[PDB]
Design a protein around this ligand. Structure first.
Ligand SMILES: OC[C@H]1O[C@@H]2O[C@H]3[C@H](O)[C@@H](O)[C@@H](O[C@H]4[C@H](O)[C@@H](O)[C@@H](O[C@H]5[C@H](O)[C@@H](O)[C@@H](O[C@H]6[C@H](O)[C@@H](O)[C@@H](O[C@H]7[C@H](O)[C@@H](O)[C@@H](O[C@H]8[C@H](O)[C@@H](O)[C@@H](O[C@H]9[C@H](O)[C@@H](O)[C@@H](O[C@H]1[C@H](O)[C@H]2O)O[C@@H]9CO)O[C@@H]8CO)O[C@@H]7CO)O[C@@H]6CO)O[C@@H]5CO)O[C@@H]4CO)O[C@@H]3CO
Length: 381
């Protein structure tokens, strides 16, 4: 009786891995079914499954941002799921839509997420009311030489800097009753140039360091040297373990207008190569029940897009959640079409080149989209 179920979970050597290990053990306690939980980096799971899945060595359950759903559907990595109407009903509509591709549902949500303004309460009293003032605050307080900042964030990552292309009226793809068009990339429009002009000023005026990464942003904030970062819910537990008195506010309004961040839904998905699609959907349900997502929030800090859980005033008005949820409500879901995968590397290289003073915002952007359009073809044929 060789009966095992395999789950791939983010390799955080901590809170996200642990929670899924716990609830997968309870399922093993309840059903007798052996459920192994392999830690695989959130962003490395899709490529691993591309190799392992068709070789019978893949996981049954996998997870990554809804960002890359569609490419996975197109590449035969995932199969749709069938769950009861009552189960389907327990989840946030925005979350469930982000997990739906070509009319079909590919997963159950674990987390609804957006970046917000997270601040060290002993360095920042009240949050700057506007973006202009948040910026002037960075201009005045940032000092790379002493490694102390008023504002630090991944200003070389398009996932972070997007509220800022969006403020200018720039989009990733064209608006044909949605995000329906792969062939009309808006990332080299005049409004996109203005957005990159704003990214540039973060390295030019606000003097953010070149070669930034999440480790640099987190480490400096944790060592108490940064007043405020732009980061997401996933970082809170880590900050609080380092003992920061974290406050969470929405992003200060920009141009007298709501900041428009990306919205990310992290889901469990069913591998198209799972030999046990029925029993794995059962597992996926067990992992996303109200009781499991209650415990996940408390352990990971990651906001579950479960309707009854979002309802609770102890979760809705929690100061460490409130700001994220409000900002999330002002956001747009990341596009989920197959050709979104093409965007990340070019546009982020374009950020590095501008930040570095190697290429102008106009040339960096024009180069980026030409590369993007070229890659749309490698997908085809
Ligand atoms: O960074 C070092 C890693 O290098 C190597 O990884 C490379 C990849 O192999 C390569 O493919 C490429 O990545 C591309 C990627 O595959 C594409 O998906 C895409 O990515 C975009 C994505 O699709 C969008 O959704 C968005 O991402 C945002 C995301 O939605 C949002 O959730 C958030 O992510 C946060 C996490 O949710 C949160 O958990 C936390 O992450 C922690 C992590 O939990 C913890 O374990 C630790 O991570 C380790 C990691 O486990 C190690 O594996 C190692 O990573 C290297 C890889 O192994 C290499 O293969 O070290 C990590 C230490 O940093 O720490 C994390 C930090 O706290 O926070 C996350 C945010 O910080 O935000 C993301 C935005 O960042 O946008 C994505 C694009 O920006 O495009 C990718 C690029 O083309 O390149 C990889 C980099 O070398």
């Amino acid at each position: 009786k060789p009966d095992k179920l395999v789950v791939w979970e983010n390799a955080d050597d901590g809170v996200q891995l642990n929670n899924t290990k716990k609830w997968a053990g309870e399922f093993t306690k309840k059903t007798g079914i052996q459920v192994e939980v392999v830690p695989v980096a959130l962003l490395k799971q899709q490529e691993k499954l591309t190799l392992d899945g068709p070789a019978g060595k893949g996981a049954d359950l996998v997870t990554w941002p809804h960002d890359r759903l569609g490419e996975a559907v197109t590449k035969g990595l995932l199969q749709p799921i069938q769950v009861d109407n009552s189960v389907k009903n327990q989840f946030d509509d925005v979350a469930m839509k982000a997990l739906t591709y070509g009319g079909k549902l590919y997963g159950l949500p674990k987390a609804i997420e957006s970046v917000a303004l997270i601040y060290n309460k002993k360095l920042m009293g009240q949050v700057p009311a506007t973006y202009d003032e948040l910026f002037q605050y960075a201009k005045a307080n940032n000092k790379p030489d002493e490694q102390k900042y008023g504002v630090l964030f991944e200003a070389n990552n398009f996932y972070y800097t997007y509220f800022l292309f969006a403020a200018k009226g720039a989009a990733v793809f064209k608006e044909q009753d949605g995000t329906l068009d792969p062939n009309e990339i808006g990332l080299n429009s005049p409004e996109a140039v203005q957005g990159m002009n704003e990214v540039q000023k973060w390295f030019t005026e606000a003097r953010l360091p070149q070669s930034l990464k999440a480790d640099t942003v987190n480490g400096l904030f944790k060592s108490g040297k940064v007043a405020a970062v732009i980061n997401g819910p996933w970082a809170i537990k880590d900050y609080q373990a380092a003992g920061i008195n974290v406050g969470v506010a929405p992003l200060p309004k920009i141009d007298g207008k709501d900041a428009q961040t990306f919205i990310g839904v992290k889901g469990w998905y069913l591998s198209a190569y799972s030999k046990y699609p029925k029993y794995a959907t059962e597992l996926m349900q067990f992992l996303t029940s109200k009781e499991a997502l209650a415990s996940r929030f408390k352990e990971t800090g990651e906001i579950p897009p479960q309707k009854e859980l979002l309802n609770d005033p102890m979760i809705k008005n929690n100061p460490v959640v409130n700001g994220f949820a409000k900002q999330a409500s002002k956001g747009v879901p990341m596009p989920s079409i197959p050709e979104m995968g093409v965007v990340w590397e070019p546009i982020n290289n374009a950020h590095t080149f501008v930040a570095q003073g190697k290429q102008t915002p106009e040339q960096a952007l024009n180069d980026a989209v030409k590369i993007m359009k070229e890659k749309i073809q490698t997908m085809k044929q």
